[PDB]
Amino acid sequence: LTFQTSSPAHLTMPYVMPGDGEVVGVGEPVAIRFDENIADRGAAEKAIKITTNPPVEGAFYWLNNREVRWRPEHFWKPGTAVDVAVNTYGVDLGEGMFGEDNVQTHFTIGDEVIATADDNTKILTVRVNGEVVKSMPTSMGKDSTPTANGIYIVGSRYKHIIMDSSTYGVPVNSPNGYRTDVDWATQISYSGVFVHSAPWSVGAQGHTNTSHGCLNVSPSNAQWFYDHVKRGDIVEVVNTVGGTLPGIDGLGDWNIPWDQWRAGNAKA
Numbered sequence: 036l037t038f039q040t041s042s043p044a045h046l047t048m049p050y051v052m053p054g055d056g057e058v059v060g061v062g063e064p065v066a067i068r069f070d071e072n073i074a075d076r077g078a079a080e081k082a083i084k085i086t087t088n089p090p091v092e093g094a095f096y097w098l099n100n101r102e103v104r105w106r107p108e109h110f111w112k113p114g115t116a117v118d119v120a121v122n123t124y125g126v127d128l129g130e131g132m133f134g135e136d137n138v139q140t141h142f143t144i145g146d147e148v149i150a151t152a153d154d155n156t157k158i159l160t161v162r163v164n165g166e167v168v169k170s171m172p173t174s175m176g177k178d179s180t181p182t183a184n185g186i187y188i189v190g191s192r193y194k195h196i197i198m199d200s201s202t203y204g205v206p207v208n209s210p211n212g213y214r215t216d217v218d219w220a221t222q223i224s225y226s227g228v229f230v231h232s233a234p235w236s237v238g239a240q241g242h243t244n245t246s247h248g249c250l251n252v253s254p255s256n257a258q259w260f261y262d263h264v265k266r267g268d269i270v271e272v273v274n275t276v277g278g279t280l281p282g283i284d285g286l287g288d289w290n291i292p293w294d295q296w297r298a299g300n301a302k303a
């Protein structure tokens with residue numbers, strides 16, 4: 036143990052996800068987010084030791100200047116134990132910025148839970164370890180505001196949340212603007228896509244797309260999703276008229292092809 040002297044305005048703290056001791060889904064990447072921009076990505080990666088059991092090949096990819104992710108080529112095998120040692124204390128992270136402390140977390144992978152939202156059938160089907168446990172009618176984004184296709188990682192969940200168009204730069208008082216109370220909302224993208232309760236589209240669920248891009252389901256089905264789907268589980272959207280979710284979204288990691296992810300984006 037060696038003390039690292041510091042100087043105000045030249046320290047950055049790492050924050051690691053998922054939580055210590057947590058059980059997460061098969062899509063959960065290791066995430067290390069710093070409270071400052073990181074100039075020397077190579078130094079940061081060198082200081083982070085991720086080990087797995089059973090062992091699988093994984094690699095780092097930076098979503099932006101603040102946050103690096105680590106994942107394998109394919110979804111985790113259930114039961115896998117993951118250990119994360121962020122040994123950044125005193126590490127020069129570039130441009131006079133030094134790691135403020137170390138962090139050490141461990142987590143495990145739970146059941147394989149993959150929910151497929153098929154735009155052609157307008158059914159969201161939840162499969163746990165391969166078996167269908169739930170089929171829910173859904174209404175996705177209308178043609179002018181479609182839901183993006185791709186693999187989404189399940190994030191946070193809310194019993195209630197406010198959808199306010201003003202955080203998207205759109206005044207509430209201008210159709211395309213809105214201030215919506217929503218129950219049972221499960222986040223699937225940082226950009227703001229959720230699976231949530233939508234009593235106002237129950238007639239369209241299973242039939243037509245009427246949403247702004249979110250996956251509208253019934254109140255009971257949304258609560259079910261809130262109760263039974265956890266961080267790191269997967270929602271795959273297929274067959275919409277939209278494009279693909281950006282790989283750097285925050286929950287879109289799996290949309291980046293393995294060869295690109297593995298090659299990384301730290302200087303050679």
Ligand SMILES: *C(=O)[C@@H]([C@@H]1N=C(C(=O)O)[C@@H](S[C@@H]2CN[C@@H](C(=O)N(C)C)C2)[C@@H]1C)[C@@H](C)O
Pocket residue numbers: 176180181182183198226227228229246247248249250
């Ligand atoms: C759920 O319906 C939310 C709604 N869904 C989306 C989405 O699917 O992207 C956004 S709509 C916004 C309009 N312009 C789009 C854009 O800038 N890009 C890059 C695709 C997104 C919004 C969060 C909300 C109504 O709860």
